[PDB]
RNA sequence: AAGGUAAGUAU
């Protein structure tokens, strides 16, 4: 638990079935700067993934 | 700076302070040629129409009208003072001088908020109001 | 009376103490603004030629100047107050459901 | 042949619309909406929006009078000019107003409407900020 | 050419159908709104100085600002030159 | 050496008519009174020139009536409205204004045109993007010449032979020249070491900076 | 502010006396309208504006535009260099940029 | 995208969740934000109608409404921020996911 | 051995819509590609500009 | 504080209403900020 | 050295 990239606890998430279809999310998080005025300090990662 | 009404003697200033019973009498003491006064007068001109329901703005030359220099300590390049129903309404700006605004502002909304706070406090019957913004620092970063 | 005499005497004394470099520094200032004035002319000077051409503007042309009208409509100029509302409860529900985890 | 319609859009655009319509009689027996689309081409859009490649635009849209307006008013200009050209063609097919009085009146109306569209906005009063109020205000209840 | 009025029952010449109908259905709310508007715009005090006062103020500014106006250039606040 | 090759080829002569203008605040009666003084009267200065400096009109400050910014276009004779007795050009110095007129008196065999593309505004240096429409094969300057000097100068037609064109911002300036190969009608654009055959029509569409003309 | 004052004084100086009363503010309104048209990159053309006054306003807008651009660029250079600045000046600089 | 696409609803759910991520920590809602979030809720409530509208836009829609632009004032450089209409935003998000 | 790190300067601003659309025809349906490329040809608004 | 968050208020009113969290924070730690060791200077006795 | 004045009404 709380070890690994991605974290092991991501296997037990309740959204695993729907997150398996989330492809290219890391580029989206980096491209969110051009849609949302706020600046994301975690542009490099997604907490759910 | 030149579009605002001007008062040319102390009696006119007294009458302007006395005439308005339901509006704040904002009077700027200084010189139309002083750059700080030019900035303050531009700010007051930008808001003159907006606050006309509860504020009236006048400009006074402290050399043409020196009758209030000793009284109101008008020894600064620019000075803005508030009067409501023949009473000078002090404001706690946080600058250590609660009687006047002796600098020039840059935000119209700032001056409008100060005028509104003065109006509300004076309507409630208060001689001192607390400014919504502190000016112990210029917030420069 | 004598107060004015004393004030005038002291003022004249202060002025005399200023004569050491008064004319020198004043002519230097005169020769220094003109050096700056060629590179940076006065604003009124830059409009002198244009101002001169305002003489032939007839009085009829002066009257016929139109007024400036705003092109923004009622909604743009004086919009109705925009109410602020709390986020729907579904947001809190989904946030608390996010923390839930499977046992297998 | 079409003295009235010549006045509005000129002889060149008149020639184009008369040729593509199949005749002055065919032009008259046609609604103004179809006349506005006379000479229109289904131009291919090559990785562009359909707005960039002007759609549903014909000879009237590219006429001298219609093209003289700013692009934000050229659709209304095309519609109005097409309607007046349809009226003139209907007049012309019966060989009436050979002098061009109908054509001159229609062109004057078109110019007046164009000027009205180009009219500068009127003076609009500035709304002052409402004075702060502390008096009690009674508000209704109910559903 | 008299057409019976659908709103009053009287007869008006056909040259005045549209205007009679438009005027006949004119809400008095329009009258009271116009009266209110007339009252408001004819009672508000002018906020900005008049034109001659603006010109006089600009003349005083030019007199006291020789770094912008005039031929000779004195200090920012001085008026002699 | 008054008559050198450079002087005999490029140097011409022009007449400068200067009329000093009084201060604008001066009253009309006092202005007329000072008109009697020779200070504010016309003064004739005949000075030779190595080249002709043509000043473009100010670039458009807004868009056209059709909400689309348009590249300014000026005829060659419109910027050649200088150097004649009719046009009066105001010179706004830092102190006083002058009405300096120019009058051509001696056309050189080869004429050099120097368009003032770069002028320094109140804060920085700006480049005028105005495009000059000029025929490159037949321009007549007999109209600009005086009636006294048009008799001696029986030849006034000029043909463009070279056109230095400046492209880009003043800081990142790029210089290209369209030369005319004598003996052929071909025009060659010379960008650094690259030589490109350019059609005669494309030259007038560029921002001309320095031009040279031949009387022939 | 200095440029606007100078332009207004010059224009009102040669205006006929009988009409300065009711048209002094109109010319300032025209001046502001031309400036905001330049800021909006939008064509400005008053059909009823006399050509000398139009040229005067055009020169005013040109000078103000030069000052505005230079001020914006200098302020942005100050921001980049780390100069200590307020929030209002940064908001105005962001708008100008 | 086929009409009977198997993963059609999963991609729509992902797109709607990504659109709602801008309000996860919000406390007050703008009128435009209120309308956009209502559109998202309506699309979630009736996924098939939203998918049909998305397919219609992908097949026929070639003209779009204007987009607002703003700049995030990073002191080194300005970063453009584009504001797309919420109706087109749903179609764009689903298209990106697919 | 040499390490080169750089950027495609003005990558986004220099994308031609016609060429991008024609290159998108190669990987997606012509209808999807036309939608994506026509989406980039929109009016950009900022206040009164 | 909750009720006023969704009411039509002017900018000054909302600015005044954003200070209550700061007032709560200041009074929570008041035995620490309000010290002669922290703020070296003269004392003023609160009226009443 | 300041950015640390409660605004008062009475005597």
Measured between alpha carbons, how far is C86 from C63 in angstroms, rounded to an integer?
Answer: 55
Cα angle value C12/C14/C19 (rounded, 5°)? 90
Sheet holding B55-61, edge to edge: B6-7, B55-61, B24-30, B78-83
Note the CA–C1' distance, B96 to K3, in angstroms.
6
Q: Do B48 and E60 touch (CB under 8 A)?
A: no
Classify residue F39 as exposed, middle or buried by CB count within 10 Å of its CB (0-12, 13-18, 19+): exposed
Distances (CA, A) of E30 to A35, E33, F94, H84: 47, 5, 61, 41
Cα angle value G10/G14/G19 (rounded, 5°)? 115
Q: Do A12 and C102 touch (CB under 8 A)?
A: yes
- Shortest Cα distance, chain E CAs vs residue C95, angstroms: 52
Measured between alpha carbons, how far is A28 from H92 in angstroms, rounded to an integer?
Answer: 13
Measured between alpha carbons, how far is B28 from B103 in angstroms, rounded to an integer?
Answer: 11
The DSSP line for G24-89 is: HHHHHHHHHHHHHHHHTT-----TTS-HHHHHHHHHHHHHHHHHHHHHHHHHHHHHHHT----HHH
Question: Measuring from the CA of residue J39 to each C1', which nucleotide is nearest?
Answer: K4
Side-chain-side CA neighbours of F101 within 13 Å: the count stands at: 14
Note the CA–C1' distance, J37 to K7, in angstroms.
31
In degrees and rounded to multiples of 5, residue H69 shows phi and psi of -120, 140
Residues of H with CB under 8 A from a CB of A: 7, 10-11, 13-14, 18, 22, 70, 72, 74, 79-82, 84, 96-97
Q: Kindly provide the resolution of this structure in angstroms, with one decimal.
A: 3.1
Strand, helix or coil at E59? helix
- Cβ within 8 Å of residue B125, ≥6 positions away: none
Method: cryo-EM
Side-chain-side CA neighbours of H25 within 13 Å: the count stands at: 2
Return the HEC string of chain C: CHHHHHHHHHHHHHHHHCCCCHHHHHHHHHHHHHHHHHHCCCHHHHCHHHHHHHHHCCHHHHHCCCCCCCCCCHHHHCCCCCCCECCCHHHHHHHHHHCCECCC
In degrees and rounded to multiples of 5, residue F164 shows phi and psi of -80, 125
User: CB–CB of B100/B79 below 8 Å?
Assistant: yes
Measured between alpha carbons, how far is F124 from G70 in angstroms, rounded to an integer?
Answer: 8
Is residue C52 left, alpha or beta, with left meaning phi > 0 and alpha meaning psi from -120 to 50?
Answer: alpha
* Strand residue runs (E) in B8-130: 24-30, 55-61, 78-83, 90-92, 128-130
In degrees and rounded to multiples of 5, residue C81 shows phi and psi of -60, 130
Mutation pick from C94, C99, C102 vs chain A, by most beta carbons of A within 10 Å, is: C102
A 10 A CB-CB count for B31 gives 24
Measured between alpha carbons, how far is D124 from D103 in angstroms, rounded to an integer?
Answer: 37
- Cβ within 8 Å of residue D48, ≥6 positions away: I17, I18, I37, I38, I41
Measured between alpha carbons, how far is F52 from D85 in angstroms, rounded to an integer?
Answer: 55
CA F200 to chain centre: 21
Is residue D100 left, alpha or beta, with left meaning phi > 0 and alpha meaning psi from -120 to 50?
Answer: left
- Shortest Cα distance, chain E CAs vs residue B141, angstroms: 31
Return the HEC string of chain D: CCHHHHHHHHHHHHHHHHHHHCCHHHHHCCCHHHHHCCCCCCCCCCCCCCCCCCCCCCCCCCCHHHHCCCHHHHHHHHHHHHHHHHHHHHHHHCCCCCCCHHHHHHHHHHHHHHHHHCCCCCCCCCCCCCCCCCCCCCCCCCC
Note the CA–C1' distance, C17 to K1, in angstroms.
31
Measured between alpha carbons, how far is G84 from B140 in angstroms, rounded to an integer?
Answer: 6
A 10 A CB-CB count for E68 gives 19
Buried residues in H24-46 as b, exposed as e (16+ CB within 10 A): eeeeebeeebbebbebbeebeee
Closest partner residue to H10 (CB to CB) among A18, A33, A36 is: A18
Q: Which chains border G (3 or more CB–CB pairs < 8 Å)?
A: B, C, E, F, H, I
Q: Where are the domains of chain B?
A: 2-136
Strand, helix or coil at F109? coil
- Shortest Cα distance, chain C CAs vs residue D29, angstroms: 41
Measured between alpha carbons, how far is J24 from J31 in angstroms, rounded to an integer?
Answer: 13
Distances (CA, A) of J7 to B34, B109, C62, I4: 42, 20, 50, 59
Q: Do chains H and E touch (3 or more CB pairs under 8 A)?
A: no
Measured between alpha carbons, how far is I46 from I40 in angstroms, rounded to an integer?
Answer: 17
J47: which DSSP letter?
Answer: P
> Residue C44: its chain E contacts at CB < 8 A?
62, 68-70
User: CB–CB of H20/H41 below 8 Å?
Assistant: no
Distances (CA, A) of B127 to B96, B115, D132, J20: 16, 14, 18, 23
A 10 A CB-CB count for B34 gives 21
In degrees and rounded to multiples of 5, residue G10 shows phi and psi of -65, -40
CATH entry 3.20.20.70 includes domain B2-136: no
């Amino acid at each position: 638990w709380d070890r690994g990239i991605p974290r092991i606890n991501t296997l037990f998430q309740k959204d695993r079935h729907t997150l398996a279809y989330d492809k290219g999310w890391r580029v989206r998080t980096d491209f969110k700067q051009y849609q949302v005025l706020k600046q994301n300090p975690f542009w490099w990662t997604h907490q759910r993934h | 700076s030149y579009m605002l009404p001007h008062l040319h003697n102390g009696w006119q200033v007294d009458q302007a302070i006395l005439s308005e019973e339901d509006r704040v009498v904002v009077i700027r003491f200084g010189h139309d040629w002083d750059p700080t006064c030019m900035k303050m007068d531009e700010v007051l001109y930008s808001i003159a129409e907006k606050v006309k329901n509860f504020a009236v703005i006048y400009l006074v030359d402290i050399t043409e009208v020196p009758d209030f220099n000793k009284m109101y300590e008008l020894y600064d390049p620019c000075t803005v003072m508030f009067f409501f129903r023949n009473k000078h309404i002090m404001i706690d700006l946080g600058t250590g001088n609660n009687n006047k605004i002796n600098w020039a502002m840059e935000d119209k909304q700032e001056m409008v908020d100060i005028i509104e706070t003065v109006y509300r406090g004076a309507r409630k019957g208060r001689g001192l109001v607390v400014s919504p913004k502190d000016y112990s620092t210029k917030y420069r970063y | 009376k004598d107060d004015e005499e004393a004030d005038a005497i002291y003022a004249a004394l202060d002025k005399r103490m200023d004569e050491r470099r008064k004319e020198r520094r004043e002519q230097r200032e005169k020769e220094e603004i003109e050096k700056y004035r060629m590179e940076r002319p006065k604003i009124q000077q830059q409009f002198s030629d244009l101002k001169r051409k305002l003489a032939e503007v007839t009085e009829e042309e002066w009257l016929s100047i139109p007024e400036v009208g705003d092109a923004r409509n009622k909604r743009q100029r004086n919009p109705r107050y925009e109410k602020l509302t709390p986020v729907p409860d579904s947001f809190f529900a989904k946030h608390l459901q996010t923390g839930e985890n499977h046992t297998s | 042949i079409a003295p009235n319609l010549s006045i509005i859009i000129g002889a060149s655009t008149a020639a184009k619309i008369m040729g593509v319509a199949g005749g002055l009689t065919n032009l008259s027996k046609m609604p103004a909406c179809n006349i506005m689309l006379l000479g229109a081409q289904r131009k291919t859009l090559s990785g562009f929006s359909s707005t960039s490649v002007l759609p549903h635009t014909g000879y009237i849209y590219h006429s001298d009078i219609v093209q003289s307006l700013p692009p934000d008013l050229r659709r209304k200009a095309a519609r109005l000019v097409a309607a007046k050209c349809t009226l003139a063609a209907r007049v012309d097919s019966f060989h009436e107003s050979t002098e061009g009085k109908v054509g001159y009146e229609l062109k004057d109306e078109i110019e007046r409407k164009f000027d009205k569209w180009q009219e500068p906005p009127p003076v609009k009063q500035v709304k002052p900020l409402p004075a702060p109020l502390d008096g009690q205000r009674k508000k209704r209840g109910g559903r | 050419e008299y057409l019976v009025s659908p709103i009053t029952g009287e007869k008006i010449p056909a040259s005045k159908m549209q205007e009679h109908m438009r005027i006949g259905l004119l809400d008095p709310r329009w009258l009271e709104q116009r009266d209110r508007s007339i009252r408001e715009k004819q009672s508000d005090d002018e906020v900005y100085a008049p034109g001659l006062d603006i010109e006089s103020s600009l003349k005083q500014l030019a007199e006291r600002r020789t770094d912008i106006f005039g031929v000779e250039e004195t200090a920012i606040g001085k008026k002699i030159g | 050496k008054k008559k050198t090759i450079v002087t005999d080829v490029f140097q011409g002569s022009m007449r400068i008519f200067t009329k000093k203008l009084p201060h604008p605040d001066l009253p009309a009666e006092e202005k007329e009174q000072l008109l009697h003084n020779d200070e504010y009267q016309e003064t004739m200065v005949e000075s030779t020139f190595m080249y002709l400096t043509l000043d473009l009109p100010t670039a458009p400050l807004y868009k056209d009536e059709k909400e689309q910014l348009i590249i300014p276009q000026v005829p060659l004779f419109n910027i050649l409205a200088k150097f004649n007795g009719i046009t009066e050009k105001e010179y706004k110095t830092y102190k006083e204004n002058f009405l300096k007129r120019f009058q051509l008196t001696k056309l050189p065999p080869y004429l050099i045109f120097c368009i003032k593309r770069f002028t320094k505004n109140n804060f920085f240096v700006e480049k005028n993007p105005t495009i000059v429409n000029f025929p490159i094969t037949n321009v007549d300057l007999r109209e600009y010449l005086s009636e006294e000097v048009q008799a001696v100068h029986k030849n006034t037609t000029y043909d463009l032979i070279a056109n230095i064109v400046h492209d880009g911002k003043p800081s990142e300036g790029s210089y290209r020249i369209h030369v005319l190969h004598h003996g052929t009608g071909k025009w060659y654009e010379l960008q650094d070491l690259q030589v490109t055959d350019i059609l005669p029509q494309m030259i007038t569409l560029s921002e001309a900076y320095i031009q040279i003309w031949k009387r022939r | 502010l200095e440029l606007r004052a100078a332009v207004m004084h010059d224009i009102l100086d040669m205006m006929p006396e009988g009409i300065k009363q009711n048209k002094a503010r109109t010319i300032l309104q025209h001046l502001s309208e031309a400036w905001r048209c330049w800021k909006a990159n939008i064509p400005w053309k008053v059909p009823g504006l006399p050509t000398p006054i139009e040229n005067m306003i055009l020169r005013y807008v040109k000078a103000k535009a030069d000052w505005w651009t230079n001020t914006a660029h200098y302020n942005r250079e100050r921001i980049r260099r780390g100069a200590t600045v307020d929030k209002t000046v940064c908001k105005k600089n962001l708008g100008r940029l | 995208p086929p009409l009977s696409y198997k993963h059609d609803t999963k991609l729509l759910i992902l797109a709607l969740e990504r659109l709602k991520e801008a309000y996860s920590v919000k406390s007050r809602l703008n009128q435009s934000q209120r309308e956009e979030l209502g559109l998202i809720e309506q699309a979630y409530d009736n996924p098939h109608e939203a998918l049909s509208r998305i397919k219609r836009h992908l097949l026929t829609q070639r003209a779009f409404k204007e987009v607002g632009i703003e700049f995030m004032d990073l002191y080194s450089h300005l970063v453009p921020v584009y504001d797309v209409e919420p109706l087109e935003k749903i179609t764009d998000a689903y298209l990106d996911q697919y | 051995n040499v390490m080169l790190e750089s950027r495609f300067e003005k990558m986004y601003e220099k994308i031609d819509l016609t060429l991008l659309n024609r290159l998108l025809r190669l990987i997606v349906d012509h209808n999807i590609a036309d939608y994506m490329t026509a989406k980039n040809n929109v009016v950009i608004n900022y206040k009164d500009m | 504080e909750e009720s006023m968050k969704w009411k039509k208020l002017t900018n000054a009113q909302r600015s005044g209403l954003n200070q209550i969290p700061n007032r709560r924070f200041t009074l929570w730690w008041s035995p620490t900020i309000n010290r002669a060791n922290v703020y070296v200077g003269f004392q003023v006795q609160l009226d009443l």
